[PDB]
Amino acid sequence: GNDYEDRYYRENMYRYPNQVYYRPVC
C-alpha cells in the first residue's frame, strides 16, 4: 500500500544479510 510500509518492508533487505546481524541482529 504505502511506500513507507512498502519501503518499510522493502527494507526487508535489511532483514537479509544485515551488515552485521549475521541475521541474529545481536
Dump the DSSP string for 1-26: --HHHHHHHHGGGTTSS-TTTTTT--
Elucidation method: NMR
Q: Please say whether the beta carbons of 4 and 10 come within 8 A.
A: no
Burial-class residue 2 by CB neighbours within 10 Å (0-12, 13-18, 19+).
exposed
- What long-range pairs does 9-15 form, CB within 8 A, spacing at least 24? none
The C-alpha atoms of residue 21 and residue 26 are separated, in whole angstroms, by 6
Domain that holds residue 19: 1-26
Between CA 11 and CA 9 the distance in angstroms is 5
Instruction: Give 21's Cβ-side CA count (13 Å radius).
Output: 10
**Number of structural domains found in the chain:** 1
Residue for grid cell 500500500: 1
